[PDB]
Amino acid sequence: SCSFDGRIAFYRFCNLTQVPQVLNTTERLLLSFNYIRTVTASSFPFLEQLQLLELGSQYTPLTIDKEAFRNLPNLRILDLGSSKIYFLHPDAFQGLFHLFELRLYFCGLSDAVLKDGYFRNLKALTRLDLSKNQIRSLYLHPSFGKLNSLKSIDFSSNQIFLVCEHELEPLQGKTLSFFSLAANSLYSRVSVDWGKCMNPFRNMVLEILDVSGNGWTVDITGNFSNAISKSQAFSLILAHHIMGAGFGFHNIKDPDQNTFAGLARSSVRHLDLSHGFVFSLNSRVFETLKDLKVLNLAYNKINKIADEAFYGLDNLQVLNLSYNLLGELYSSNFYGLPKVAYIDLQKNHIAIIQDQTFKFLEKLQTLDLRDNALTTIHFIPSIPDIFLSGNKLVTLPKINLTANLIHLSENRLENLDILYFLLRVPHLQILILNQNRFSSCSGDQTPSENPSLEQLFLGENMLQLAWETELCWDVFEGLSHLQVLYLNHNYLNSLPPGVFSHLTALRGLSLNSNRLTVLSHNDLPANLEILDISRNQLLAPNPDVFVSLSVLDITHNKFICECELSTFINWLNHTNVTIAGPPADIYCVYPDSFSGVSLFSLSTEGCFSLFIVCTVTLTLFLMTILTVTKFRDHPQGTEPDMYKYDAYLCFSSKDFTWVQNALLKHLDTQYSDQNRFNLCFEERDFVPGENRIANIQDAIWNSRKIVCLVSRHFLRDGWCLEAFSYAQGRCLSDLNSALIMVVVGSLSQYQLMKHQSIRGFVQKQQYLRWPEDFQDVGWFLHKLSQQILKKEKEKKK
Amino acid sequence: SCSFDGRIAFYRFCNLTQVPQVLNTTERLLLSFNYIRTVTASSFPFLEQLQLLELGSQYTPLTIDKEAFRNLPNLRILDLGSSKIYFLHPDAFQGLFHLFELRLYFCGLSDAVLKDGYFRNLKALTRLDLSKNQIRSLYLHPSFGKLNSLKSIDFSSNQIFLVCEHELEPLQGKTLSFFSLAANSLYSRVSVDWGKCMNPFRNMVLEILDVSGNGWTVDITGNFSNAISKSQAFSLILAHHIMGAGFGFHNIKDPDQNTFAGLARSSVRHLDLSHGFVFSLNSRVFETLKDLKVLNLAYNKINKIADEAFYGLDNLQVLNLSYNLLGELYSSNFYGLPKVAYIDLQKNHIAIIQDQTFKFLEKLQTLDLRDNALTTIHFIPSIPDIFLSGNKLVTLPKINLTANLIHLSENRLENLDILYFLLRVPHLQILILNQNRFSSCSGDQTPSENPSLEQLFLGENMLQLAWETELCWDVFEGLSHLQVLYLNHNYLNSLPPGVFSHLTALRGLSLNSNRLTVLSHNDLPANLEILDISRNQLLAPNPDVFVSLSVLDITHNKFICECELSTFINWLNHTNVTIAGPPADIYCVYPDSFSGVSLFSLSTEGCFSLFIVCTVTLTLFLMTILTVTKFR
C-alpha cells in the first residue's frame, strides 16, 4: 500500500475476483497484471470514493456487462490499457458523472467503427484517448455534439485511409469548442478530398493538430496539404519525417514545393518539429509563415544554421531548442527576432559560445540555459530570470537591473563573474549556488550591491584557506547556506565577529557537515529562528544565546564525554528540551568504554553498576508514568452527547481575508493531525438537501460552542438570519459561555437596525475585541482558545 | 587505534610533529588531515616496521628534504594524496627498498617534467601512480629502464598534447615488461605523429591501455587511431564517449569510418566500454575485431539489442554486462557465441525472460545472474555454477549433471522449481536458501536425488503448516540450517523421528530463532559436533544425549525456574560446563520475584544480590503512593 487509508495498490498478485479487504474510503485503487475476464453487473459496490481507478492494464477482459460502474459517481479517470474486449454493451459506462479522461490504449477494437460507441452520458468527458486501435473511419458520430467539455483526443495507430468532408459535420455544429485532433499519427493513409462546396477544414478552429508520420512517400503527402487549406489552427506539428529544412524542402526537391503552397493561405500560429531528426537547417525556412507566434523544436540534431535561417519569423515569442545543438556555431543566431522572449536550450553539447551571439534582441525576458554551454554573456538583453547550471568556468558577465532572478548549480566559478554580475541586480531575490566548488573568496568583492538579496545558498564549495572575512556586509535579509565549506578551524578560532553582524533578518543559518572545533555564539541577530549544526567536531560552550531561537539542531558530533568539559554538557541540559534537536542522534565518540549514549544521560561525576541501572530505571519508571497523565482541548469522546465539532465559526463573506488567514489557521494549527480542534462552517460543510437558515441550525447542535465574528458587514447579511431564529426558538441565552462574541472591527450605531437581539449580546459586554497593536497578538489567542475550551454552564440553578 | 599493537590511526588530530607515543611494531600508521609542511631529515626514526604509511593526504607539505624515509626498509606503499610540494630533492626517497606502489594523486606538480623525477633507486616500484598532475611531456625518462617490476602506471588529468615517437624509446629497450599505460585520460590533446621509420607503438607489447576521454571532437580523435596502428595490446578501453554503437558509429556519420580503419590491422584481444552511456546498440558492432578473446560492458544503458548485434565475435570468453539491461528484450541474444563461458549480468531491471534466450551456446561454465530477471531456464547449456538471487517466483528449471554449484538468496520459491532442479545434480555441493520464504513443503518431493549434498541452508522460510515430514531421507552429509521457520509448537509435539534418522555425517544443526515448546532429542547421529539452540520457548528434558556433542548453545529461552520442572534444570547441570553454552545469556522469564538469574544459580527446593533490588523496589513502590497524592 502507498498511503494509509486512501492509496492502495495491487501490482501483479494474480487474483480472480476484486479485493474486498480494501476500505470504502480508498481513493486510488490499482488492479493490473491480473485477470477477471467476465465483468458482471455490480462489480465494485464496495468502494465509492474512487478517482484513480486504473482498471484494464493487461487484465485481459473478454466481455463487459451493464451496471459495471454504477456505484462510482466520483470516478475521475479510468485506464483500460492493453485490453481485449470483444462485446461492447451500450449501457456499460452508466453512472459515471465525473468522468473526465479515459485511456483506451489497445482496448482490442475488433469492432472498429465508433458509431456503436457509448460516450453520450459523459458530459465531463474532456480527454478521450483512443490509441493502438483499428478505427477505419474518422467519421465523427453525432454524439460528439453533446461533448462540450471534450478538449482533447489522441487518434493514433488506427487505420483511416480517406478523410471526406461528411466525416467532419459535428465539428461545424459547435461554435465554441477546443479540439486537439491528434489523428493521422502512425497511420497508412493514401489520399483525401478537396474542393467541394466547403473544405473539410473550412470554418473550423482546432486547438491542436498532430500529423506524426502520415504517408509513405512525399508525393502522396502533398495532396493532404491541399485539403488542410483555409483552416484556423493554433498548433501544427509536422514530426517524424522532415530530415532537412529549407525554402520548402522535405524529401524530393520536386514535389516538396506543393507542400508550403497550401499552408501559405492558412495562418499558422504554432509549428513544432519534434523527433524529426533535422540534420541540416538550410537558409530561410519559415518565410511563408510570418504569423507564427510560437515555435518548437525538441530532440533534434541541427548543424547548419544560416544567417537567414530564422528569417520570416517577424513576431516570435516562445521557442524551445531542447537538445539540438553541438557541431560549432556562428555569430548572431536570432537576427530577426526582436519580440522573442522565452527560449529553452536545455541539454546540449556546445563548445564555446562566441561574443556576438544573442544579437538583435530586446524583449527577451526568460533565458533557460540548463547544461547549455560554457556561457559567455556580453550582448544579453533585459532578461529578469536566467538559469545557468551544469557548466564550467564563466567569463565576465554583462547584465542590467532587470535581472531579479538567477541560478547557478553544479558549476565551477571564481570571484570575478559573481561580483560584476551582482553590481547591477539589487532587484535580485532568489539565488542558488550548490556544488560550485568556489576557488578563491575575496574579502568584500563578491557579494556586493544586493540589498533585496533573499535566498543565497553556498553549499559545497571552497574558500581562500578558510573563512576569515565578512562578505555579507550590505545584505540585510541574507539567508546564507553554509554546508561543508571545508573551513579549517584554525582560522575559525579567530572568526571575524563582523560577518554575522549586518545580518539582522536571518531566518536560519545552517552550519552542517562542516569541520569546526569551537562553536562561537554571536547572538547579535534577533530574528534567527533556527540554526542547523550536525556532522561537526564542536565542543565549546558560550553564555550568549539568541532570543528567537527555538530549534537548535545539534546531533551527531564529536562530543567529548569526560570530566574535562563539564560546562558544555551543562549548557545543553539547561537549554531544556524546547531548545534542542533529536537526542536520539547524539552519542559520545572519544569514550572507549561508553559508546552510544545521549548527552542527556551521562553522569557529571569528577575524575555496583547493576544497582545503578536498576534504580535509575525505577526513577524513570516513577516519573514516565506520572507525567504523561499530567502533561497530556476538550475531548469530544468524553462529551455527554455526540458532537462532531468544537466551535462553529459564523462570519461574513466580505471578511473572508481574516477568517481564512488568521482565525482558521490559528485554531487549526493546534491538534491539526490529532483533528481535535475542529471548526464548523456554512460553505465548507453544508447540505445541498437542506435550507439556508437551517444549515446554521444544525451547525449549532453539532458544534460545542458558537464563535461568531461581529463586524460592520456581519450585521448587513450575517445577522439577518440569526436574529430571526432567536425570535421563534430560543437556544443561546445572555450570560452563557455557549455563545462567544468577537469584534474584528468597531461597529457603529447607525448600522444597527431594529434588531433587538444584536444589542442584547453587546449589553453584557463579554466580547473579545481584536487588538490593534502587534504586541497584543497572543493575549487574544489565549482567551480565544480558553472560552471555547471552557466548560459550558449547566442548566440547574 | 583500530588494532592493539600494530594498527594505529590518527584521523584528523592536528599535530605539528609526528606522534612519538606510537610503538616500534606499528605496521599501519595513518596521518591524514594534519599539517607538517617542512619535512626535515630523520622524520620517522621511531617506527621501522611500517608497511601502510599513508602520508600526504592534505598534509600540505611545502618542501621535502633528504633522508626523510631512511629508516623504513619494510615500507610497502606511500600515498601522498592532495599534497602541494614545490621543491623536489633528488635523494629524498632514499632507503626505500621494499617500496611497491606509490600514489601521487594531486601532488601539485609545479615542476611538470618528469626528468627531474627520482624513482631510480626504487626497483620494487610496481604500480607508480601519477594522477591529477600537470605533466606536459609523455617523454619517458631513461630511469624506466631500471624499473623492471614496473607493472602499471596511471597518467590521468595532466596535460600532454603531442605524443611523438621519441617519447617512447625506453619501451622498446625492454623485451619483457608488462605496462598498463593509462594515459590520455581526461586530457586536452590535439594530435600525434604518424608514419616515420617506425610507428610510436610499433613492436611494443602493452598490458593495459586506457583512453578515458581524449579529444574534444570526433575529427581530431581520428588522427590518434591512425597512430596506434600495429600495436600488440592485451586490452583497450574506449570509455566516456561512445553514446551509440554500430558498423563503426561514434558521433558524426562521416568521420567515424576512419576509426576502425586503424584498429582493423591491430589484433585487439580485450575491448571494454565502461561508463560509455551507450543507449542504442545497432546491428554488427565488433565485426573487424574477431580476435577479441574477452569483452566487457560495465555501467551502460542499453535499450534494445539487434539480432546481428553481437555478430563478429568468433572466440569470446568473458563478458561482464553489469547494469545495462531493461527496456524489453528479444529472442536469441548470443547466437554467435559458442565459445562463450563467463558472463556477468549483475544488477538489472528485466521483467520477464523469453524461452529462447541463451540460444546457440555450449562452453558456458559460469552464469552469474545476481538480481538479473524473473529467471526462466529452458535452453541452458552445461553450466556447473550459477547464482540466482534478488529475484522472484521461478518457473520450471532445466539443467543437467554438470551443475555442481547453485545459489538462491532473497527470493520467493515453491516446491516445483527446487524438486526438478535437484533431480539431475548429484554432483551438487554448495546450496544456499537464505530468506526465500518457502510456500508449501512437500513430504519427499523437493530435496530428492542429491547424495553429495554438502551445504544446505534453509534459513527464513515457511512450510505447509509446520514441520511434520522427512524431506532429507536420501541426504547423507546434509548440513541443514533451520533458523526461524515459523514452526507451530502444536505439530512439533509429534515430530517425525525419521527426519534426523538418515543424517549420519552431520556437522551441526542450527535450531535458533524458532518457536518450539518441547525440545526432543534423537541422538541417532553420531557425528553431530554442535547444536545451536537459542531464542526459543523450550522447557523439556530428555535422557538421550549425543556422543560427539561438545558445544551446546542454550541461551535466551523461556525457561520456567519453579518447582514444577525440576528434572530439566537438573539435567543441564550434570552435563558439566564442557557441554553447555554461555551462562551469562540465560535468565528466568516466567518468575516475577526471582528474575534475571542464570540456571546455574537457582536453588532446588520444593514448593541475595538480586534480592535487595527486589526489596528496595517494593519499599519505593510503597513510599511513593504515600508522597505523591500529597505533593503535586
Ligand SMILES: *[C@@H]1O[C@H](CO[C@@H]2O[C@@H](C)[C@@H](O)[C@@H](O)[C@@H]2O)[C@@H](O)[C@H](O)[C@H]1NC(C)=O
Ligand atoms: C488474491 O488472489 C489469490 C489467488 O486466488 C485464486 O486462487 C486459486 C483458488 C485459483 O482459482 C486462482 O485462479 C485464483 O487467482 C488468493 O489466494 C488471495 O486470497 C487474493 N487476495 C486476497 C483478497 O486475500
Ligand SMILES: *[C@@H]1O[C@H](CO[C@@H]2O[C@@H](C)[C@@H](O)[C@@H](O)[C@@H]2O)[C@@H](O)[C@H](O)[C@H]1NC(C)=O
Ligand atoms: C463499506 O460501505 C458499505 C456501504 O455503505 C452504506 O450503505 C448504506 C447504509 C447507505 O447509507 C449507503 O449510502 C452507503 O454506501 C457498508 O455496507 C459497509 O459496512 C462498509 N464497510 C465497512 C467499513 O464496514
Ligand SMILES: *[C@@H]1O[C@H](CO[C@@H]2O[C@@H](C)[C@@H](O)[C@@H](O)[C@@H]2O)[C@@H](O)[C@H](O)[C@H]1NC(C)=O
Ligand atoms: C493528387 O490528386 C491528383 C488529382 O486526383 C484526381 O485525378 C482525376 C482522377 C480526377 O478526375 C479527380 O478525381 C482528381 O483531380 C492525382 O493526379 C495525384 O495522384 C494525387 N496525389 C497522390 C495522392 O498520389
Ligand SMILES: *[C@@H]1O[C@H](CO[C@@H]2O[C@@H](C)[C@@H](O)[C@@H](O)[C@@H]2O)[C@@H](O)[C@H](O)[C@H]1NC(C)=O
Ligand atoms: C517547451 O517545450 C516543452 C516540451 O514540449 C513537448 O513535451 C511533450 C508533450 C513531448 O512528448 C514533446 O513532444 C515536446 O518536447 C514544454 O514542456 C514547454 O511547455 C514548452 N515551453 C512553453 C511554451 O511553456
Ligand SMILES: *[C@@H]1O[C@H](CO[C@@H]2O[C@@H](C)[C@@H](O)[C@@H](O)[C@@H]2O)[C@@H](O)[C@H](O)[C@H]1NC(C)=O
Ligand atoms: C544597461 O543600462 C545602461 C544604462 O541605462 C540607463 O542610462 C541612463 C539613460 C539612465 O536612465 C539610467 O538610470 C539607466 O541605467 C545602458 O547604457 C546599457 O545599454 C544596458 N546594458 C545593456 C543591456 O546593453
Ligand SMILES: *[C@@H]1O[C@H](CO[C@@H]2O[C@@H](C)[C@@H](O)[C@@H](O)[C@@H]2O)[C@@H](O)[C@H](O)[C@H]1NC(C)=O
Ligand atoms: C528552561 O525552561 C524554563 C521554563 O520555561 C517555560 O516557563 C513557562 C513560561 C511555561 O509556559 C513552561 O511550559 C516553559 O517550560 C525557563 O524558566 C528556563 O529559563 C529555561 N532554561 C534556560 C535555557 O534558561
Ligand SMILES: *[C@@H]1O[C@H](CO[C@@H]2O[C@@H](C)[C@@H](O)[C@@H](O)[C@@H]2O)[C@@H](O)[C@H](O)[C@H]1NC(C)=O
Ligand atoms: C541536567 O542538569 C541538571 C541541572 O542543571 C543546572 O545545574 C546548576 C549548575 C543550576 O545552577 C542550574 O543552572 C541548573 O539546574 C543537573 O542537576 C543534572 O545532573 C543533569 N542531568 C544529567 C544528564 O546528569
Ligand SMILES: *[C@@H]1O[C@H](CO[C@@H]2O[C@@H](C)[C@@H](O)[C@@H](O)[C@@H]2O)[C@@H](O)[C@H](O)[C@H]1NC(C)=O
Ligand atoms: C597532537 O597535537 C597537539 C597540539 O599540536 C600543536 O601544538 C601547537 C604547536 C599549535 O600549533 C597547535 O595548533 C597544534 O595542534 C598536542 O597538544 C597533543 O598532545 C598531540 N597528541 C598527542 C600525540 O598526544
Ligand SMILES: *[C@@H]1O[C@H](CO[C@@H]2O[C@@H](C)[C@@H](O)[C@@H](O)[C@@H]2O)[C@@H](O)[C@H](O)[C@H]1NC(C)=O
Ligand atoms: C624503537 O627502536 C629504537 C632503536 O632500537 C635499536 O637501535 C639499534 C641498536 C638498531 O639495532 C635498531 O635497528 C634498533 O631499532 C629504540 O631507541 C626505541 O626504544 C624503540 N622503541 C620502543 C619500543 O621503546
Ligand SMILES: *[C@@H]1O[C@H](CO[C@@H]2O[C@@H](C)[C@@H](O)[C@@H](O)[C@@H]2O)[C@@H](O)[C@H](O)[C@H]1NC(C)=O
Ligand atoms: C589529422 O591530419 C590531417 C592531415 O594529415 C597530415 O598532416 C600533415 C602531417 C601533412 O603534411 C600530411 O602528411 C597529411 O595530410 C589534418 O588536416 C587534420 O586537421 C588532423 N586532425 C585534426 C587535429 O584536426
Ligand SMILES: *[C@@H]1O[C@H](CO[C@@H]2O[C@@H](C)[C@@H](O)[C@@H](O)[C@@H]2O)[C@@H](O)[C@H](O)[C@H]1NC(C)=O
Ligand atoms: C568482470 O567485471 C568485474 C567488474 O567490472 C569492473 O571492474 C573494474 C574495471 C571497475 O571499474 C569496476 O567498477 C567494474 O565493475 C570484475 O570484478 C571481474 O574481474 C570481471 N571478470 C573477470 C574477467 O574476471
Ligand SMILES: *[C@@H]1O[C@H](CO[C@@H]2O[C@@H](C)[C@@H](O)[C@@H](O)[C@@H]2O)[C@@H](O)[C@H](O)[C@H]1NC(C)=O
Ligand atoms: C541433459 O542430458 C540429456 C541426456 O544426455 C545423455 O544421454 C545419453 C547419450 C547418455 O550418455 C546419458 O548418460 C546422458 O545423460 C541430453 O539429451 C540433454 O540435451 C541435456 N540437457 C540439455 C542441456 O539440453
Ligand SMILES: *[C@@H]1O[C@H](CO[C@@H]2O[C@@H](C)[C@@H](O)[C@@H](O)[C@@H]2O)[C@@H](O)[C@H](O)[C@H]1NC(C)=O
Ligand atoms: C548441580 O547438580 C548437582 C547434581 O545433581 C544431581 O545429583 C543426584 C541427586 C543425581 O540424581 C543426578 O541426576 C544429578 O547430577 C547438585 O547436587 C547441585 O546442587 C547443583 N548445583 C546447584 C545449581 O545447586
Ligand SMILES: *[C@@H]1O[C@H](CO[C@@H]2O[C@@H](C)[C@@H](O)[C@@H](O)[C@@H]2O)[C@@H](O)[C@H](O)[C@H]1NC(C)=O
Ligand atoms: C561430566 O563429566 C564427568 C567427568 O569430568 C571430566 O573429568 C576429567 C577426567 C576431565 O576430562 C574434565 O575435563 C572433565 O570435566 C563424567 O564422569 C560425566 O559422565 C559427565 N556427565 C555427563 C554429561 O554424563
